[PDB]
Amino acid sequence: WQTHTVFNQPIPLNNSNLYLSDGALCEAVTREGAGWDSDFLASIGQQLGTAESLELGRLANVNPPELLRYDAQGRRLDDVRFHPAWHLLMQALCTNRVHNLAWEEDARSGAFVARAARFMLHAQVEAGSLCPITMTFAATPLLLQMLPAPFQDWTTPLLSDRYDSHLLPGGQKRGLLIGMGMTEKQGGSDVMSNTTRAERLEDGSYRLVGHKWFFSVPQSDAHLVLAQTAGGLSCFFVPRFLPDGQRNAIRLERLKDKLGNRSNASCEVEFQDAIGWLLGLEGEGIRLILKMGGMTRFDCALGSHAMMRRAFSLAIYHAHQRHVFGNPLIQQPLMRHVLSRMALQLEGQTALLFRLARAWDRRADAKEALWARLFTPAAKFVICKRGMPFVAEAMEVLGGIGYCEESELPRLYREMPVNSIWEGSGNIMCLDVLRVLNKQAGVYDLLSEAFVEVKGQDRYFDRAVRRLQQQLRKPAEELGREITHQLFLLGCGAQMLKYASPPMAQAWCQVMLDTRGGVRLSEQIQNDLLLRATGGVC
Amino acid sequence: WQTHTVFNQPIPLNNSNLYLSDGALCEAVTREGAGWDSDFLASIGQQLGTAESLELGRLANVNPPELLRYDAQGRRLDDVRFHPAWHLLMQALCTNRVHNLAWEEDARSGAFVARAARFMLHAQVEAGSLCPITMTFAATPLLLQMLPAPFQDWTTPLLSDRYDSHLLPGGQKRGLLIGMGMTEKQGGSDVMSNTTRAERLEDGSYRLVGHKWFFSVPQSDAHLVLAQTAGGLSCFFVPRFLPDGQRNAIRLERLKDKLGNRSNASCEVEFQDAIGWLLGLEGEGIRLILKMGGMTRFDCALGSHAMMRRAFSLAIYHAHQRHVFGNPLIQQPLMRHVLSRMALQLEGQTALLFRLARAWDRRADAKEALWARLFTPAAKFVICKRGMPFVAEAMEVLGGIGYCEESELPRLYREMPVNSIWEGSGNIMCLDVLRVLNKQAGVYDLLSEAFVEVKGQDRYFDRAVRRLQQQLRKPAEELGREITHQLFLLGCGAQMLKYASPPMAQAWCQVMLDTRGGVRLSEQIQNDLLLRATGGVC
Amino acid sequence: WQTHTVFNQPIPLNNSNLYLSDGALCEAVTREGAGWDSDFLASIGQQLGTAESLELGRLANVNPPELLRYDAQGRRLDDVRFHPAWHLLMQALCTNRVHNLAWEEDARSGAFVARAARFMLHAQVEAGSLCPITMTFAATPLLLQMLPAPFQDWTTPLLSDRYDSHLLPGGQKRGLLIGMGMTEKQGGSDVMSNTTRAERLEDGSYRLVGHKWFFSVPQSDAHLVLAQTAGGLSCFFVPRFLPDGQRNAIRLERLKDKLGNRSNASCEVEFQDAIGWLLGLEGEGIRLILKMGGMTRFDCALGSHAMMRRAFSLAIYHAHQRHVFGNPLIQQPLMRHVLSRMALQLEGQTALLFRLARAWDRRADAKEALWARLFTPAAKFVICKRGMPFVAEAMEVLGGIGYCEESELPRLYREMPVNSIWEGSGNIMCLDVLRVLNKQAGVYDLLSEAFVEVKGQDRYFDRAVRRLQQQLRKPAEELGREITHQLFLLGCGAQMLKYASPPMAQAWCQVMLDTRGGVRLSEQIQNDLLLRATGGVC
Ligand SMILES: Cc1cc2nc3c(=O)[nH]c(=O)nc-3n(C[C@H](O)[C@H](O)[C@H](O)COP(=O)(O)OP(=O)(O)OC[C@H]3O[C@@H](n4cnc5c(N)ncnc54)[C@H](O)[C@@H]3O)c2cc1C
């Protein structure tokens, strides 16, 4: 009955450990002060790597949410309906405290780093569910700092490990999600162009009339929303339900039909005299949310890195099994070269991101705070931009089967641009880097110290330092991407030189910084890279 | 911001008790020997009536199953993927033993009646999930009677309360489902036209080559399949997995794209030297499955009745709330007339079906067995045919909102024809009734006795008995539907006269049997009918 | 490579002549004064019966319209996007003047009858596209009678044979469609409960604020819309574009997700100070549209009849080819009986509808006008109610293949209830019949004359006349359906007795009016019925 036998078809990667298979991550977690979380990380790495877990990710994306503007009786409903897989993903994210680990009372030293490792494991399985998690993690410290009086009973659920999908006022719920409404049709990068208007009421609250053009996670229990007041652009707490239990006047008009990120609901919304509570002062909306923005930019970089890691893991498991021209694909000199360069890129990214996580963890230290202020937008720019060609290359390793929606690769590929577009996109990251280099007291000293610490170790690194120094003499706005990319590489290189094995740091520096390419990697480096990326080290 | 206020929109029926709201059913359960099950029935009636339960029914139908013929590597898979709601429905059906209550060791007197009541509650929530349940309930006694030796370890899971969706040989599973493969492209009514061929192997098993054109529940652990042998048309046990653990050679070719019944997978399949085990003798396939057929025909009648009951319950809850021309719709004389006639039809159907369930329960008694043999096809014909106009009328009570897929009514309406088409359809039921009346020893005596028992109580009933007697003098095949319908009504009428209150039996007889219509129901009868249909009695 | 041979599978009906195959229709067209249209009818009957034509019907339903509330820039759009098949269907409908043949200057005697025959041919191919056609045909004479001054240039396009899908003010278009906005969330039967409000402006036009809950064909160039004024419920011309070229303020909020009629867009809409022009006087909205309603009710009856005709034609073509138990299915005594009864029902319906079409054609005659006033709602009630069980029976002739969406039968079945629900639904038709019988001068005389004309010809007919006479003594509202059904049958019977062959009229009267059923049809009648239904006569 058959016309052929099927052979030389790799088995797809599943039922693996997402943590234990990543040598660079395991090393970074210990190095950066989160080793106490390693047993937990191995545990969730196993749970998240199962066929069942990966299926929840697939189901949540192929059954995207449905906007319910009205009920069957023609009354306004303004709700969103998700596939059950979505709620199961949210439950595990919250159980694992990806939304608030760092903010717990008695959080231990390294909690920001431990939380980043947890986030990176989840992000490999499914990306859309990270959006509410990212916004809630970033908004929580600000909300706890400024929590308006009628919402004092939100502190307990903000600190829980309990996802709660009930359509109830937040104070009645066991856990909460918080979103961000900034972008308007006339601009997302330039939020001063916002026309949503807030008028102060007798009781000190404000009435808002306007719109937000991309308003993710409409089901959040509140959104922090930018609006204009007499005193300038300001930040408001806009809860889904008012203190009295009535629904607030946020009208969900249309759900975005997106390239990727499809599991996540993003809406176009309008405020019809919605009630908001001013956070901070009138006119300080942009300043107030700077650090909130910093944390979301970090998560963008970490998310793209995580997706690159998953795509790479799929590619290498496939290339190990697939034979071409009589030999394993991973043994073919050109393929082995390409995959080894990919692995080297992920090693550097992991070292940089986790050092950056430690900086955010230790931000009570002014120099750590400054390092995070400078390298966060740099990391978002370079890593998020790299995501697209990196994932395409992984897909090409698999070949035609990597172009079919049955594979994880298309979904990863379709996700990659979102992280690059988020929060003013790549150019805004670079202009922010230039602003910091220009205006921030202490920056040039911080950089010099970091670079002197490793001076003499590598000729390519030292040449790149001199090139950046020259470039910073006249930092033209048109060179913002060149400068940001150079700065990012020097950050990565300094971490590699300090902490990677010497042959690895040497390989990294030559590949990344030796201005003439044509760099061949030694056999031993390629072997070590590919072994480290499949477990080996942990 | 609003253009209007929404008013006079009924709230849709949910969070009600499917059992306690049905006076006729509660009375029938006690009358027919299953009163010991009443507490359980009230419990599951509450569970099944919740918004959450009704949502599982919706989800399983709007997310229909997907046929997986191949995996991503191009190897044959032959599997079906369902929405999780489907599996949750199956779990509750099996927990409630709708597939096997009557067949348990130590099953108590009335178990067939108790099982019918349980089935009727489930059928109101979701219909497609009743297909595997119906086939498994009907096939189980036959399989236990004839179970081939290599499958002796199936007896325990056949008797469990555990749904098991694992892709494993049945002997390794905690519970089992059994299907039926009869229909071929050239005929489903006339199964002797089957061309699927079975050849005897050295070990006594047979190799099958052929097709089945409608093959529901392909995921069943076995199907009973008709095939031709040297000795005539025969019945085979065809398991999904062979005794050695290999998949059997059943190729799933195409999933039907159906009007209704969409939650249930129905496939077109081909046998490529599939292995089957002969049940019974060569050439006795048609005879062997007669009683199996009887049970499935009963479930068809019961299913259509249940859907009619749900549609009626929705219509009356709506008409009680909706106002037209200044008064409740249920108070408008013409609407109240129509709904009262509907209620009266369901009273008769409930009385007949449960008497029939008792007949099947007590089938060790030759007269009970004969009553079931005769009235089962009659009930399937009339009740399944009535389903379509009855549900359309309920939809029209709701008006335009009953035509929208948000309402339960369209799904009920789209389901109704399947039960009428099943197992040779309406004409085959009537030809079977004629065959029984002609050939079956004892029938005319059984009928006479039943009719004499109530003779003198109602003039319309006694006139209808005389009309049937005349008709049976020359029972032409072309009058098969007229005769079947008359017989059905006399069955219903005898139950009403014996057991309904006299004004109710009087109303039933005049409406159903008074050859000139124009029958107006008294105010008291309409009130009692509509109250009984909303709980009152239980 | 094969497991079986496919055989005994009928070829599906296509490439047939929808007109020439229908003996009763061809005879009715000539009888009722539209014989001059017979060549044209045969021509379009051929065109509409092709596989390509039937495919347009399928495509328009499986690719339903999409509501475009906003454009990609977030500006309001309020438009609907259709599959190209929809526009091709509309083009042929308008070329054939199904929307206005009767209203042309110099329309010839019999034009209403010719238009009804044309409508019936189209309705067999696709039903949703008849909605704009029906509303435009019904509204056109009223609009031409009352056309408000700023829209004088609409007269030419209202009278064209040119469908025009351009998004332009009607006065710039080559042809126009008109819709009807009556139903609100609180009621469609009782339109006096409408809360949409119209306020008179300085220039004599009115500003409307409110909603309509089912608002079909939102893309119409205008809708006639009921709204409350100081002077009572009134009818407004509400154009899609104002005289100055601006879009009118009609907000399309949601598209209905329907059981059937899926090719046709039906919206929930809101008026945000939309401009309307009063037709007639304040407070005469209900009266003004009575005749408009009459024409749409006629089209409902004609549409259900047409769908029944298509379903029957499919069933008989199938049963002629399919063999069961060694003989053609159409030769099996019970099946032949059932199909013959079906054919007889269509013969009566065709005779009645076309006599009714002639009444509407000759409505300058007071007695013809009265016949149409009385029999139109009666016909809508009985015929539209019959549609559901009739089409289900056809599906059951085909068997399981008739339950699959590849067949035309499911789409026909899912369409049938809409015609029964339309314009206040079945109960409102019956209450209207009772109102006419009670209040309308001349009615009892008109009926007596009609009945005396055929008195003595058939005993069952004469007995039914006496039964109706008795019933009309005390015409209780609760007997509205019994009375309407009796009246309808007497209408049909009088046409059959006057114009059918005597054996046919005899067969009709006995089957339809002989209060004890068990009526067997002669061999010759069954043969003549089935031959007439496949062409024979034309
Ligand atoms: C899936 C998804 C979900 C989203 N969810 C949210 C949400 O929940 N909340 C929210 O507020 N927003 C959300 N956004 C919107 C997102 O933040 C914006 O798209 C982003 O800030 C860019 O704004 P914009 O699209 O208006 O582009 P613009 O601001 O018009 O920018 C266009 C391009 O110009 C570049 N540019 C801008 N200014 C300069 C300059 N001075 N010099 C050089 N280049 C410049 C930008 O970098 C960008 O590349 C979401 C977006 C997506 C895709």
Ligand SMILES: Cc1cc2nc3c(=O)[nH]c(=O)nc-3n(C[C@H](O)[C@H](O)[C@H](O)COP(=O)(O)OP(=O)(O)OC[C@H]3O[C@@H](n4cnc5c(N)ncnc54)[C@H](O)[C@@H]3O)c2cc1C
């Ligand atoms: C959703 C669905 C699921 C199904 N699942 C299964 C399944 O799991 N297993 C399986 O075996 N089948 C299944 N069936 C097929 C079903 O049993 C058949 O469709 C049914 O038996 C009718 O057979 P048929 O379609 O070949 O019609 P035919 O046998 O061709 O009958 C067509 C019509 O002719 C009538 N007729 C037949 N013989 C006579 C006669 N002698 N005199 C007068 N009238 C006659 C029939 O009553 C019917 O109305 C399924 C069907 C559906 C719709």
Ligand SMILES: Cc1cc2nc3c(=O)[nH]c(=O)nc-3n(C[C@H](O)[C@H](O)[C@H](O)COP(=O)(O)OP(=O)(O)OC[C@H]3O[C@@H](n4cnc5c(N)ncnc54)[C@H](O)[C@@H]3O)c2cc1C
């Ligand atoms: C596909 C579709 C398209 C439609 N398009 C349009 C459109 O374009 N324009 C428009 O105006 N409407 C439209 N309608 C609405 C349609 O006209 C209404 O649904 C219909 O008039 C019934 O009104 P309702 O749904 O409010 O039911 P109700 O008025 O609430 O009636 C419910 C039931 O009660 C019965 N009833 C009402 N009064 C009495 C009484 N006095 N005594 C006894 N019984 C009574 C009715 O007959 C009906 O069976 C559309 C409907 C559908 C399904």
Ligand SMILES: [Ca+2]
């Ligand atoms: Ca090698």
Ligand SMILES: [Ca+2]
């Ligand atoms: Ca009353």
Ligand SMILES: [Ca+2]
């Ligand atoms: Ca014959």
